[PDB]
Write a protein that binds this ligand. Structure first.
Ligand SMILES: *C[C@@](*)(O)[C@H](CCCNC(N)=[NH2+])NC(=O)CNC(=O)[C@@H](N)CCC(=O)O
Ligand SMILES: *C[C@@](*)(O)[C@H](CCCNC(N)=[NH2+])NC(=O)CNC(=O)[C@@H](N)CCC(=O)O
Lengths: 234, 234
Protein backbone atom coordinates (compact mmCIF):
# COMPACT_ATOMS: atom_id res chain seq x y z
CA UNK A 1 0.00 0.00 0.00
CA UNK A 2 1.54 3.28 -1.22
CA UNK A 3 0.95 6.38 0.90
CA UNK A 4 -0.09 4.68 4.11
CA UNK A 5 1.27 3.82 7.55
CA UNK A 6 1.60 0.60 9.55
CA UNK A 7 -1.85 -0.73 10.33
CA UNK A 8 -2.91 -0.83 13.93
CA UNK A 9 -2.49 -4.35 15.26
CA UNK A 10 -6.26 -4.69 15.99
CA UNK A 11 -7.73 -2.87 13.00
CA UNK A 12 -7.23 -5.75 10.56
CA UNK A 13 -8.66 -8.85 12.29
CA UNK A 14 -10.18 -10.17 9.04
CA UNK A 15 -7.10 -9.87 6.74
CA UNK A 16 -5.91 -13.31 5.58
CA UNK A 17 -2.50 -14.16 4.08
CA UNK A 18 -2.27 -16.62 1.17
CA UNK A 19 1.21 -18.12 0.75
CA UNK A 20 2.97 -21.24 -0.55
CA UNK A 21 6.41 -22.84 -0.80
CA UNK A 22 7.45 -19.91 -3.03
CA UNK A 23 6.34 -17.35 -0.46
CA UNK A 24 3.65 -14.70 -0.11
CA UNK A 25 0.91 -14.60 -2.77
CA UNK A 26 -1.99 -12.36 -1.79
CA UNK A 27 -4.37 -11.23 0.90
CA UNK A 28 -7.92 -12.42 1.57
CA UNK A 29 -11.00 -11.73 3.68
CA UNK A 30 -12.57 -14.02 6.27
CA UNK A 31 -16.35 -13.52 6.06
CA UNK A 32 -17.51 -16.28 8.40
CA UNK A 33 -15.80 -19.11 10.32
CA UNK A 34 -15.45 -21.34 7.22
CA UNK A 35 -14.97 -19.14 4.15
CA UNK A 36 -12.43 -16.79 2.65
CA UNK A 37 -12.90 -14.34 -0.23
CA UNK A 38 -9.96 -13.22 -2.33
CA UNK A 39 -9.13 -12.47 -5.97
CA UNK A 40 -9.34 -15.07 -8.71
CA UNK A 41 -5.93 -14.07 -10.07
CA UNK A 42 -4.32 -15.09 -6.74
CA UNK A 43 -5.04 -18.75 -7.32
CA UNK A 44 -2.14 -21.22 -7.20
CA UNK A 45 -1.92 -25.03 -7.41
CA UNK A 46 -1.23 -25.33 -3.74
CA UNK A 47 -1.22 -22.71 -1.00
CA UNK A 48 -2.21 -22.18 2.62
CA UNK A 49 -4.02 -19.47 4.47
CA UNK A 50 -2.66 -17.69 7.55
CA UNK A 51 -4.90 -15.85 10.03
CA UNK A 52 -4.09 -13.36 12.79
CA UNK A 53 -0.86 -12.06 11.24
CA UNK A 54 0.71 -8.67 11.96
CA UNK A 55 4.49 -8.76 11.95
CA UNK A 56 6.23 -11.47 9.98
CA UNK A 57 9.29 -11.33 12.25
CA UNK A 58 7.60 -11.06 15.64
CA UNK A 59 4.69 -13.52 15.60
CA UNK A 60 1.31 -13.25 17.33
CA UNK A 61 0.54 -15.96 19.88
CA UNK A 62 -2.86 -16.58 18.25
CA UNK A 63 -2.20 -17.19 14.50
CA UNK A 64 -4.01 -20.03 12.73
CA UNK A 65 -3.26 -21.94 9.54
CA UNK A 66 -5.60 -23.82 7.26
CA UNK A 67 -5.53 -25.35 3.80
CA UNK A 68 -8.04 -24.52 1.08
CA UNK A 69 -10.46 -27.46 0.95
CA UNK A 70 -12.52 -25.97 -1.94
CA UNK A 71 -12.06 -23.09 -4.39
CA UNK A 72 -14.84 -21.48 -6.49
CA UNK A 73 -14.63 -19.10 -9.46
CA UNK A 74 -17.35 -17.63 -11.65
CA UNK A 75 -18.46 -20.26 -14.19
CA UNK A 76 -18.75 -17.50 -16.81
CA UNK A 77 -15.30 -15.98 -16.33
CA UNK A 78 -13.13 -15.13 -19.36
CA UNK A 79 -10.27 -17.60 -19.81
CA UNK A 80 -7.62 -15.11 -21.09
CA UNK A 81 -8.41 -11.98 -19.06
CA UNK A 82 -6.81 -12.73 -15.70
CA UNK A 83 -8.75 -9.94 -13.96
CA UNK A 84 -12.17 -10.68 -15.44
CA UNK A 85 -14.59 -11.29 -12.56
CA UNK A 86 -11.76 -11.22 -9.98
CA UNK A 87 -13.37 -13.17 -7.16
CA UNK A 88 -12.69 -16.59 -5.60
CA UNK A 89 -14.38 -18.28 -2.62
CA UNK A 90 -12.20 -20.59 -0.48
CA UNK A 91 -13.90 -23.18 1.74
CA UNK A 92 -11.52 -23.92 4.65
CA UNK A 93 -10.54 -27.45 5.63
CA UNK A 94 -11.43 -26.56 9.21
CA UNK A 95 -13.29 -23.68 10.89
CA UNK A 96 -11.43 -20.72 12.35
CA UNK A 97 -12.76 -19.23 15.58
CA UNK A 98 -12.62 -15.63 16.75
CA UNK A 99 -9.71 -14.51 18.89
CA UNK A 100 -7.78 -11.35 19.76
CA UNK A 101 -6.46 -10.92 16.23
CA UNK A 102 -9.04 -12.88 14.22
CA UNK A 103 -12.65 -12.04 13.32
CA UNK A 104 -14.87 -12.08 10.18
CA UNK A 105 -16.08 -9.19 8.06
CA UNK A 106 -19.80 -8.82 7.31
CA UNK A 107 -21.08 -8.72 3.75
CA UNK A 108 -22.57 -5.44 2.54
CA UNK A 109 -26.30 -4.75 2.62
CA UNK A 110 -25.96 -1.84 0.15
CA UNK A 111 -23.13 -0.42 -2.06
CA UNK A 112 -20.88 2.57 -1.21
CA UNK A 113 -21.70 6.01 -2.52
CA UNK A 114 -19.31 7.97 -4.73
CA UNK A 115 -17.08 9.95 -2.36
CA UNK A 116 -17.24 7.62 0.67
CA UNK A 117 -13.99 7.18 2.60
CA UNK A 118 -12.67 3.59 2.69
CA UNK A 119 -9.64 1.68 4.06
CA UNK A 120 -7.22 -0.43 1.95
CA UNK A 121 -4.67 -2.76 3.62
CA UNK A 122 -1.93 -5.25 2.71
CA UNK A 123 1.75 -6.29 2.70
CA UNK A 124 2.31 -5.20 -0.88
CA UNK A 125 4.78 -2.72 -2.35
CA UNK A 126 5.15 0.58 -0.51
CA UNK A 127 7.46 2.16 -3.09
CA UNK A 128 5.95 2.28 -6.62
CA UNK A 129 9.07 1.04 -8.43
CA UNK A 130 11.25 -0.72 -5.84
CA UNK A 131 10.71 -4.33 -4.80
CA UNK A 132 10.66 -3.41 -1.10
CA UNK A 133 7.93 -5.07 0.99
CA UNK A 134 6.78 -4.34 4.59
CA UNK A 135 7.01 -6.55 7.59
CA UNK A 136 3.66 -5.34 8.94
CA UNK A 137 0.65 -4.50 6.75
CA UNK A 138 0.14 -0.87 5.70
CA UNK A 139 -3.16 0.95 5.88
CA UNK A 140 -4.38 3.96 3.91
CA UNK A 141 -7.69 5.73 3.38
CA UNK A 142 -8.92 6.37 -0.16
CA UNK A 143 -12.19 7.54 -1.63
CA UNK A 144 -14.82 6.00 -3.84
CA UNK A 145 -14.64 7.74 -7.22
CA UNK A 146 -17.04 8.04 -10.11
CA UNK A 147 -16.72 4.92 -12.26
CA UNK A 148 -16.17 7.04 -15.39
CA UNK A 149 -12.79 8.26 -14.07
CA UNK A 150 -11.57 4.67 -14.30
CA UNK A 151 -13.37 3.90 -17.58
CA UNK A 152 -11.52 6.82 -19.16
CA UNK A 153 -8.22 6.35 -17.29
CA UNK A 154 -7.98 2.81 -18.74
CA UNK A 155 -9.62 3.36 -22.13
CA UNK A 156 -7.47 0.71 -23.89
CA UNK A 157 -9.42 -2.00 -22.06
CA UNK A 158 -12.87 -2.55 -20.58
CA UNK A 159 -13.47 -1.70 -16.93
CA UNK A 160 -16.45 -3.86 -15.90
CA UNK A 161 -19.42 -2.36 -14.08
CA UNK A 162 -19.22 -4.96 -11.33
CA UNK A 163 -16.24 -3.03 -9.98
CA UNK A 164 -15.54 0.01 -7.76
CA UNK A 165 -13.18 2.80 -8.86
CA UNK A 166 -11.24 4.04 -5.82
CA UNK A 167 -8.19 6.03 -4.84
CA UNK A 168 -6.99 9.62 -4.81
CA UNK A 169 -7.32 11.75 -7.95
CA UNK A 170 -3.79 13.17 -7.74
CA UNK A 171 -2.32 9.79 -6.72
CA UNK A 172 0.03 9.34 -3.79
CA UNK A 173 -2.05 6.57 -2.19
CA UNK A 174 -3.05 3.33 -3.92
CA UNK A 175 -2.85 -0.46 -3.58
CA UNK A 176 0.10 -2.08 -5.33
CA UNK A 177 1.52 -5.41 -6.43
CA UNK A 178 0.89 -8.10 -3.81
CA UNK A 179 -1.96 -6.13 -2.19
CA UNK A 180 -4.42 -8.15 -4.32
CA UNK A 181 -7.26 -10.08 -2.72
CA UNK A 182 -7.32 -7.72 0.25
CA UNK A 183 -10.46 -5.92 1.40
CA UNK A 184 -11.58 -2.37 0.60
CA UNK A 185 -13.61 -1.45 3.68
CA UNK A 186 -16.04 1.46 3.89
CA UNK A 187 -17.62 2.27 7.25
CA UNK A 188 -16.70 -1.20 8.57
CA UNK A 189 -18.38 -3.04 5.70
CA UNK A 190 -16.72 -5.35 3.19
CA UNK A 191 -17.20 -3.45 -0.10
CA UNK A 192 -14.46 -4.45 -2.55
CA UNK A 193 -11.62 -6.87 -3.30
CA UNK A 194 -8.30 -5.38 -4.52
CA UNK A 195 -8.11 -6.36 -8.24
CA UNK A 196 -5.90 -4.15 -10.50
CA UNK A 197 -4.64 -0.69 -11.53
CA UNK A 198 -1.90 1.52 -12.97
CA UNK A 199 1.85 1.05 -13.63
CA UNK A 200 3.19 1.76 -11.13
CA UNK A 201 0.56 2.34 -8.49
CA UNK A 202 -0.14 5.76 -7.01
CA UNK A 203 0.23 7.76 -10.21
CA UNK A 204 -2.11 10.74 -10.50
CA UNK A 205 -5.25 10.15 -12.57
CA UNK A 206 -4.98 6.37 -12.41
CA UNK A 207 -7.19 4.96 -9.57
CA UNK A 208 -7.49 1.31 -8.60
CA UNK A 209 -10.29 -1.03 -9.68
CA UNK A 210 -11.85 -3.30 -7.00
CA UNK A 211 -14.31 -6.20 -7.46
CA UNK A 212 -17.65 -4.88 -6.20
CA UNK A 213 -18.61 -7.39 -3.51
CA UNK A 214 -22.19 -6.23 -3.47
CA UNK A 215 -22.84 -7.24 -7.09
CA UNK A 216 -21.73 -10.72 -6.14
CA UNK A 217 -23.91 -11.13 -3.03
CA UNK A 218 -26.30 -13.57 -4.59
CA UNK A 219 -23.40 -15.60 -5.93
CA UNK A 220 -21.57 -15.70 -2.60
CA UNK A 221 -24.64 -16.77 -0.61
CA UNK A 222 -25.67 -19.37 -3.22
CA UNK A 223 -22.22 -20.99 -3.29
CA UNK A 224 -21.97 -20.88 0.52
CA UNK A 225 -25.48 -22.34 1.00
CA UNK A 226 -24.57 -25.31 -1.20
CA UNK A 227 -25.51 -24.43 -4.80
CA UNK A 228 -22.37 -24.71 -6.87
CA UNK A 229 -24.00 -24.08 -10.25
CA UNK A 230 -24.49 -20.44 -9.30
CA UNK A 231 -23.47 -18.16 -12.15
CA UNK A 232 -22.15 -14.64 -11.57
CA UNK A 233 -23.39 -11.24 -12.77
CA UNK A 234 -22.09 -10.61 -16.31
CA UNK B 1 22.62 -32.31 11.30
CA UNK B 2 25.45 -33.75 9.19
CA UNK B 3 25.12 -37.35 7.96
CA UNK B 4 21.41 -38.10 8.34
CA UNK B 5 18.08 -37.62 6.56
CA UNK B 6 14.83 -35.70 7.04
CA UNK B 7 13.07 -36.63 10.25
CA UNK B 8 9.75 -38.41 10.14
CA UNK B 9 7.04 -35.77 10.76
CA UNK B 10 5.91 -37.59 13.97
CA UNK B 11 9.29 -38.49 15.52
CA UNK B 12 10.17 -35.04 16.83
CA UNK B 13 7.12 -33.71 18.67
CA UNK B 14 9.15 -32.27 21.57
CA UNK B 15 11.48 -30.28 19.28
CA UNK B 16 11.06 -26.52 19.85
CA UNK B 17 12.33 -23.66 17.67
CA UNK B 18 13.75 -20.47 19.19
CA UNK B 19 13.87 -17.51 16.80
CA UNK B 20 13.71 -13.73 16.80
CA UNK B 21 13.60 -10.77 14.37
CA UNK B 22 17.04 -11.72 12.98
CA UNK B 23 15.72 -15.15 12.25
CA UNK B 24 16.40 -18.63 13.56
CA UNK B 25 18.44 -19.07 16.75
CA UNK B 26 18.42 -22.64 18.11
CA UNK B 27 16.53 -25.82 18.90
CA UNK B 28 14.98 -26.68 22.29
CA UNK B 29 13.02 -29.33 24.23
CA UNK B 30 9.55 -29.35 25.77
CA UNK B 31 9.75 -31.30 29.11
CA UNK B 32 6.19 -30.55 30.31
CA UNK B 33 3.42 -28.12 29.31
CA UNK B 34 5.06 -25.00 30.84
CA UNK B 35 8.83 -25.45 30.49
CA UNK B 36 11.44 -25.69 27.72
CA UNK B 37 15.04 -26.81 28.19
CA UNK B 38 17.77 -25.53 25.87
CA UNK B 39 21.43 -24.48 25.78
CA UNK B 40 22.57 -21.36 27.60
CA UNK B 41 24.57 -20.13 24.61
CA UNK B 42 21.30 -19.80 22.65
CA UNK B 43 20.21 -16.82 24.76
CA UNK B 44 19.27 -13.53 23.17
CA UNK B 45 17.52 -10.44 24.56
CA UNK B 46 14.32 -11.23 22.68
CA UNK B 47 13.16 -14.39 21.08
CA UNK B 48 10.13 -16.59 20.70
CA UNK B 49 9.48 -20.30 20.66
CA UNK B 50 7.59 -22.29 18.02
CA UNK B 51 6.09 -25.74 18.69
CA UNK B 52 4.77 -28.36 16.27
CA UNK B 53 7.10 -27.30 13.44
CA UNK B 54 8.53 -29.61 10.75
CA UNK B 55 8.76 -27.91 7.34
CA UNK B 56 9.50 -24.18 7.33
CA UNK B 57 7.81 -24.02 3.86
CA UNK B 58 4.65 -26.09 4.36
CA UNK B 59 3.26 -25.41 7.82
CA UNK B 60 1.46 -27.78 10.15
CA UNK B 61 -2.00 -26.71 11.26
CA UNK B 62 -1.32 -27.32 14.96
CA UNK B 63 1.70 -25.06 15.51
CA UNK B 64 1.87 -22.94 18.68
CA UNK B 65 3.90 -19.83 19.52
CA UNK B 66 4.83 -18.69 23.05
CA UNK B 67 7.13 -16.13 24.64
CA UNK B 68 9.84 -16.62 27.31
CA UNK B 69 8.32 -15.47 30.62
CA UNK B 70 11.36 -16.42 32.71
CA UNK B 71 14.85 -17.68 31.88
CA UNK B 72 17.12 -19.58 34.31
CA UNK B 73 20.90 -20.27 34.22
CA UNK B 74 23.26 -21.96 36.69
CA UNK B 75 24.11 -19.33 39.32
CA UNK B 76 27.63 -20.74 39.45
CA UNK B 77 28.35 -20.34 35.74
CA UNK B 78 31.60 -18.98 34.27
CA UNK B 79 31.26 -15.44 32.85
CA UNK B 80 33.48 -15.56 29.74
CA UNK B 81 32.94 -19.28 28.91
CA UNK B 82 30.08 -19.48 26.35
CA UNK B 83 29.68 -23.25 26.80
CA UNK B 84 30.31 -23.78 30.53
CA UNK B 85 27.23 -25.40 32.14
CA UNK B 86 25.45 -25.04 28.80
CA UNK B 87 21.82 -25.34 29.91
CA UNK B 88 18.94 -22.84 30.21
CA UNK B 89 15.42 -23.35 31.54
CA UNK B 90 12.58 -21.26 30.04
CA UNK B 91 9.15 -20.87 31.63
CA UNK B 92 6.52 -20.26 28.93
CA UNK B 93 4.12 -17.33 29.25
CA UNK B 94 1.21 -19.72 28.63
CA UNK B 95 0.90 -23.56 28.68
CA UNK B 96 1.26 -25.68 25.53
CA UNK B 97 -1.18 -28.58 25.08
CA UNK B 98 -0.43 -31.87 23.34
CA UNK B 99 -1.59 -32.24 19.73
CA UNK B 100 -0.58 -34.34 16.72
CA UNK B 101 2.85 -32.67 16.46
CA UNK B 102 3.38 -31.46 20.05
CA UNK B 103 4.09 -33.67 23.11
CA UNK B 104 6.67 -33.41 25.91
CA UNK B 105 9.72 -35.56 26.47
CA UNK B 106 10.43 -37.18 29.84
CA UNK B 107 13.42 -36.40 32.03
CA UNK B 108 15.86 -39.31 32.57
CA UNK B 109 15.79 -41.63 35.57
CA UNK B 110 19.33 -42.93 34.94
CA UNK B 111 22.23 -41.80 32.66
CA UNK B 112 22.81 -43.54 29.32
CA UNK B 113 25.47 -46.18 28.99
CA UNK B 114 28.55 -45.98 26.78
CA UNK B 115 27.81 -47.53 23.40
CA UNK B 116 24.09 -46.62 23.48
CA UNK B 117 22.54 -45.57 20.18
CA UNK B 118 20.94 -42.09 20.37
CA UNK B 119 19.01 -39.81 17.96
CA UNK B 120 20.18 -36.22 17.21
CA UNK B 121 17.92 -33.71 15.37
CA UNK B 122 17.76 -30.08 14.20
CA UNK B 123 17.76 -27.46 11.44
CA UNK B 124 21.52 -26.91 11.57
CA UNK B 125 23.97 -27.22 8.67
CA UNK B 126 23.79 -30.45 6.65
CA UNK B 127 27.08 -29.91 4.81
CA UNK B 128 29.96 -28.81 7.15
CA UNK B 129 31.48 -26.14 4.87
CA UNK B 130 28.39 -24.73 3.04
CA UNK B 131 26.05 -22.24 4.79
CA UNK B 132 23.09 -24.29 3.49
CA UNK B 133 20.17 -25.03 5.84
CA UNK B 134 17.38 -27.67 5.84
CA UNK B 135 13.75 -26.89 5.43
CA UNK B 136 12.70 -29.87 7.47
CA UNK B 137 14.74 -31.13 10.45
CA UNK B 138 17.38 -33.81 9.84
CA UNK B 139 17.78 -36.80 12.18
CA UNK B 140 20.66 -39.28 12.68
CA UNK B 141 21.79 -42.02 15.08
CA UNK B 142 25.13 -41.58 16.87
CA UNK B 143 26.70 -43.61 19.66
CA UNK B 144 27.58 -42.65 23.21
CA UNK B 145 31.35 -42.85 23.36
CA UNK B 146 33.85 -43.01 26.18
CA UNK B 147 34.07 -39.47 27.65
CA UNK B 148 37.88 -39.70 27.37
CA UNK B 149 37.75 -39.57 23.54
CA UNK B 150 36.43 -36.02 23.93
CA UNK B 151 38.85 -35.18 26.74
CA UNK B 152 41.93 -35.97 24.58
CA UNK B 153 40.45 -34.82 21.25
CA UNK B 154 39.88 -31.36 22.75
CA UNK B 155 43.06 -31.22 24.81
CA UNK B 156 43.19 -27.47 24.01
CA UNK B 157 40.35 -26.62 26.47
CA UNK B 158 38.80 -28.65 29.28
CA UNK B 159 35.84 -31.03 28.82
CA UNK B 160 33.61 -31.08 31.93
CA UNK B 161 32.43 -34.32 33.49
CA UNK B 162 28.81 -33.20 33.25
CA UNK B 163 28.72 -33.92 29.51
CA UNK B 164 28.24 -36.82 27.16
CA UNK B 165 30.73 -37.52 24.39
CA UNK B 166 28.81 -38.80 21.38
CA UNK B 167 29.30 -39.19 17.65
CA UNK B 168 30.89 -41.69 15.30
CA UNK B 169 34.62 -42.39 15.61
CA UNK B 170 35.56 -42.15 11.90
CA UNK B 171 33.36 -39.03 11.60
CA UNK B 172 30.63 -38.43 9.03
CA UNK B 173 27.82 -37.80 11.52
CA UNK B 174 27.59 -34.99 14.06
CA UNK B 175 25.52 -31.94 15.01
CA UNK B 176 26.53 -28.64 13.44
CA UNK B 177 26.13 -24.88 13.87
CA UNK B 178 22.50 -23.90 14.68
CA UNK B 179 21.82 -27.43 15.93
CA UNK B 180 22.51 -26.33 19.53
CA UNK B 181 19.89 -26.62 22.25
CA UNK B 182 18.20 -29.55 20.57
CA UNK B 183 17.81 -32.95 22.36
CA UNK B 184 19.95 -36.14 22.42
CA UNK B 185 17.47 -39.01 22.81
CA UNK B 186 18.53 -42.55 23.75
CA UNK B 187 15.71 -45.11 23.90
CA UNK B 188 13.07 -42.41 24.02
CA UNK B 189 14.77 -40.86 27.02
CA UNK B 190 15.96 -37.26 26.97
CA UNK B 191 19.69 -37.61 27.78
CA UNK B 192 21.54 -34.55 26.46
CA UNK B 193 21.50 -31.01 25.06
CA UNK B 194 23.52 -30.12 21.91
CA UNK B 195 26.30 -27.80 23.02
CA UNK B 196 29.60 -27.87 21.13
CA UNK B 197 32.17 -29.74 19.06
CA UNK B 198 34.87 -29.28 16.43
CA UNK B 199 35.27 -27.06 13.34
CA UNK B 200 33.65 -28.27 11.24
CA UNK B 201 31.27 -30.99 12.40
CA UNK B 202 31.90 -34.54 11.24
CA UNK B 203 35.74 -34.54 11.20
CA UNK B 204 37.04 -37.99 12.12
CA UNK B 205 38.06 -38.27 15.78
CA UNK B 206 36.27 -35.15 16.99
CA UNK B 207 32.87 -36.10 18.60
CA UNK B 208 30.10 -33.88 19.85
CA UNK B 209 29.98 -32.66 23.43
CA UNK B 210 26.42 -32.60 24.87
CA UNK B 211 25.22 -31.30 28.24
CA UNK B 212 24.43 -34.40 30.41
CA UNK B 213 20.81 -33.96 31.54
CA UNK B 214 20.91 -36.53 34.30
CA UNK B 215 23.50 -34.48 36.23
CA UNK B 216 21.16 -31.50 36.33
CA UNK B 217 18.03 -33.41 37.36
CA UNK B 218 18.03 -31.86 40.82
CA UNK B 219 18.64 -28.32 39.67
CA UNK B 220 15.93 -28.71 37.04
CA UNK B 221 13.36 -30.05 39.56
CA UNK B 222 14.31 -27.48 42.18
CA UNK B 223 13.93 -24.66 39.66
CA UNK B 224 10.61 -25.83 38.25
CA UNK B 225 9.19 -26.44 41.73
CA UNK B 226 10.02 -22.91 42.92
CA UNK B 227 13.52 -22.77 44.37
CA UNK B 228 15.06 -20.01 42.26
CA UNK B 229 18.31 -20.33 44.25
CA UNK B 230 19.05 -23.92 43.29
CA UNK B 231 22.72 -24.20 42.45
CA UNK B 232 24.16 -26.39 39.67
CA UNK B 233 26.63 -29.26 39.84
CA UNK B 234 30.25 -28.00 39.49
C1 LIG C 1 -2.69 -9.79 -7.92
C2 LIG C 1 -2.48 -8.35 -7.40
O1 LIG C 1 -1.28 -8.53 -6.55
C3 LIG C 1 -2.33 -7.11 -8.59
C4 LIG C 1 -2.69 -5.80 -7.86
C5 LIG C 1 -2.19 -4.56 -8.56
C6 LIG C 1 -2.86 -3.31 -8.04
N1 LIG C 1 -2.35 -2.11 -8.71
C7 LIG C 1 -2.77 -0.87 -8.45
N2 LIG C 1 -2.25 0.16 -9.11
N3 LIG C 1 -3.72 -0.66 -7.54
N4 LIG C 1 -2.96 -7.13 -9.93
C8 LIG C 1 -2.32 -7.55 -11.03
O2 LIG C 1 -1.17 -8.00 -11.00
C9 LIG C 1 -3.09 -7.53 -12.36
N5 LIG C 1 -2.72 -6.48 -13.31
C10 LIG C 1 -3.50 -6.24 -14.37
O3 LIG C 1 -4.53 -6.86 -14.60
C11 LIG C 1 -3.06 -5.13 -15.31
N6 LIG C 1 -4.03 -5.07 -16.45
C12 LIG C 1 -3.04 -3.80 -14.56
C13 LIG C 1 -1.77 -3.57 -13.75
C14 LIG C 1 -2.00 -3.45 -12.26
O4 LIG C 1 -2.79 -4.25 -11.70
O5 LIG C 1 -1.39 -2.57 -11.63
C1 LIG D 1 25.17 -22.84 19.49
C2 LIG D 1 25.21 -24.25 18.83
O1 LIG D 1 24.41 -24.17 17.61
C3 LIG D 1 26.64 -24.74 18.45
C4 LIG D 1 26.60 -26.23 18.15
C5 LIG D 1 27.89 -26.73 17.54
C6 LIG D 1 27.99 -28.24 17.53
N1 LIG D 1 29.19 -28.66 16.81
C7 LIG D 1 29.53 -29.92 16.57
N2 LIG D 1 30.63 -30.19 15.87
N3 LIG D 1 28.77 -30.92 17.00
N4 LIG D 1 27.71 -24.46 19.41
C8 LIG D 1 28.62 -23.51 19.23
O2 LIG D 1 28.63 -22.76 18.24
C9 LIG D 1 29.68 -23.36 20.33
N5 LIG D 1 31.04 -23.61 19.88
C10 LIG D 1 32.03 -23.71 20.76
O3 LIG D 1 31.87 -23.59 21.97
C11 LIG D 1 33.43 -23.97 20.20
N6 LIG D 1 34.31 -24.25 21.37
C12 LIG D 1 33.40 -25.18 19.26
C13 LIG D 1 32.78 -24.91 17.90
C14 LIG D 1 31.78 -25.98 17.49
O4 LIG D 1 30.86 -26.26 18.28
O5 LIG D 1 31.92 -26.53 16.38
Amino acid sequence: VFGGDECNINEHRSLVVLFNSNGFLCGGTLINQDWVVTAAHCDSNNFQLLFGVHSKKILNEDEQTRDPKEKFFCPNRKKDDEVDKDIMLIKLDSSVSNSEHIAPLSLPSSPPSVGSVCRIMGWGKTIPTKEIYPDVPHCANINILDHAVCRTAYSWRQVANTTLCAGILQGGRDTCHFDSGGPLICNGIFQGIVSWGGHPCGQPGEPGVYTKVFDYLDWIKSIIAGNKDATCPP
